[PDB]
Ligand binder design. Structure first.
Ligand code: 6T1
Ligand code: SAM
Ligand code: ZN
Ligand code: ZN
Ligand code: ZN
Length: 429
């Protein structure tokens, strides 16, 4: 197993992870090497395929020209996984489009053939033991899994010996239930991976640990003091949202309803859905209509970023914030959601002033809605610091970069390469 920890039966939460020793804020509970992992398509050329090192001058695979490495060692070490895609990418050309889940699942199947025995990533929970929720699958989820199985056969039949369709539906369901996205220091999507021992941890909206990544290595650090006998919880979702939203997401993606202290008390729900203090106060039904409108625009924007222009996208943000502002306060999470989306459009357009304009409005409400140590808060401080630095506002930039560092020292560890990069940014300017 893992020193100072153990697997146990968590009542009403299946299997979980329990502490056998005290952990202080910032302590590393454990590390977990990726069992299987894939660099996202949009990050190719920026990060090494094998170790995820972000570097300039990465060497391109000569055959597919769509894999980049630190050197010939990273190239060679990645080949058992890269061969599943190398020749297929040049053969299918523009037609090569498997989903990231399919790309990851192909790598799980390849690893199972090469290394059927328990790996150092499975000291407490094995990939074969993963919870699937197969019995809970509705028509929509079975249809998505069936599309994934067809893409798996379509693009990965060369080296894989597939089990029957029944074993593949269990696998794809296990992957959705236990798979991790890997994000960078700005919470930008890097790729997807399997970390079996990390997937043993259950969810809480007031977690006592945070998961971070050091290349393809997952690290688990305390964000609250943990005592012997206490269960170790991480957050599976974005904690900005009120209780109903959080549980709608946990039910849809993980088939359960959270009963943590935040979900039971609903303490932060009032401030999260803050209403304007108007002379004629807004009616209960008028609030409910705006909450419904707010969730609908969130979904509308999500679809729109796939085909609308940057000005159309910014229009959706501006117009929806205008309609919402008649009922909702600026610190309200639905207002904040649109501002964050608008900041993201600005960043893409390289409209640094516009991105800064939004980030400045988001940061104080983020600090009040998110937990004490939050990757979402650290990432916003970091973006703000980098925008201020880029726009020659070096004192404001240094202050924001040091706010990011203070959180990241707890979550990522004092010695994290991301913190060395931020300190170099402070010292170079
Ligand atoms: O890292 C993530 N969040 C932080 C906590 C992670 N923790 C790991 C262990 C527990 C929680 C995360 C977020 C989103 N996506 C994934 C992800 C990564 C890999 C493969 C599928 C992935 O999930 C995608 C998104 N999604 C939800 C819809 C869904 C749910 C069930 C089924 Cl059976 C089907 Cl068909 C479809 C499919 C991971
Ligand atoms: C990644 S697994 C975590 C380990 C899992 N408990 C097991 O036995 O394999 C995620 C699943 O654990 C369960 N789970 C996690 N957190 C929970 C919670 N707070 N309450 C209830 N069930 C929870 C759900 O069934 C969820 O889909
Ligand atoms: Zn490398
Ligand atoms: Zn190649
Ligand atoms: Zn909760």
């Amino acid at each position: 197993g893992l020193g100072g920890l153990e697997r146990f039966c968590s009542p009403g939460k299946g299997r979980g992870l329990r502490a056998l020793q005290p952990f202080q804020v910032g302590d590393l509970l454990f590390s977990c090497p990726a069992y299987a992992y894939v660099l996202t398509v949009n990050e190719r050329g920026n990060h090494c395929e094998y170790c995820f090192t972000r570097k300039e001058g990465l060497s391109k695979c000569g055959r597919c020209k769509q894999a980049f490495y630190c050197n010939v060692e990273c190239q060679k070490e990645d080949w058992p996984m890269h061969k599943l895609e190398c020749s297929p990418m040049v053969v299918f050309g523009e037609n090569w489009n498997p989903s990231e889940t399919v790309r990851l699942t192909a790598r799980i199947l390849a690893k199972q053939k090469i290394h059927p025995e328990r790996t150092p990533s499975e000291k407490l929970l094995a990939v074969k033991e993963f919870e699937s929720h197969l019995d809970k699958l509705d028509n929509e989820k079975k249809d998505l899994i069936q599309s994934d199985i067809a893409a798996l056969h379509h693009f990965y039949s060369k080296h894989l010996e597939f089990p029957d369709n029944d074993s593949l539906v269990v696998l794809f369901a296990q992957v959705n239930c236990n798979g991790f996205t890997i994000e960078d220091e700005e919470l930008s999507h890097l790729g997807s991976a399997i970390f079996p021992d990390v997937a043993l941890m259950n969810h809480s909206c007031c977690p006592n640990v945070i998961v971070t990544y050091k290349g393809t290595l997952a690290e688990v650090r305390a964000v609250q003091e943990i005592k012997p006998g206490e269960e170790v919880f991480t957050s599976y979702i974005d904690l900005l949202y009120p209780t109903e939203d959080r549980n709608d997401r946990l039910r849809d993606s993980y088939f359960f309803t959270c009963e943590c202290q935040e979900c039971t008390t609903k303490d932060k729900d009032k401030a999260k859905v803050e209403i304007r203090k108007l002379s004629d106060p807004p009616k209960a039904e008028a609030i409910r209509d705006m909450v419904r409108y707010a969730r609908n625009v969130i979904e509308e924007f999500r679809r729109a970023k796939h085909y609308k222009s940057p000005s159309e996208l910014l229009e959706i943000c501006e117009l929806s914030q205008e309609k919402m502002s008649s009922v909702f306060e600026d610190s309200n999470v639905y207002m904040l959601h649109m501002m964050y989306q608008a900041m993201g459009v600005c960043l893409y357009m390289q409209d640094w002033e516009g991105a800064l304009q939004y980030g400045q409005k988001i940061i104080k409400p983020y600090s009040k809605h998110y937990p004490l140590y939050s990757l979402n808060v650290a990432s916003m401080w970091l973006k703000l610091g980098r925008l201020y630095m880029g726009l020659e506002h070096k004192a404001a930039g240094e202050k924001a970069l040091k706010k990011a560092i203070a959180i990241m020292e707890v979550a990522h560890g004092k010695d994290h390469p991301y913190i060395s990069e931020i300190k170099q940014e402070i010292e170079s300017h």
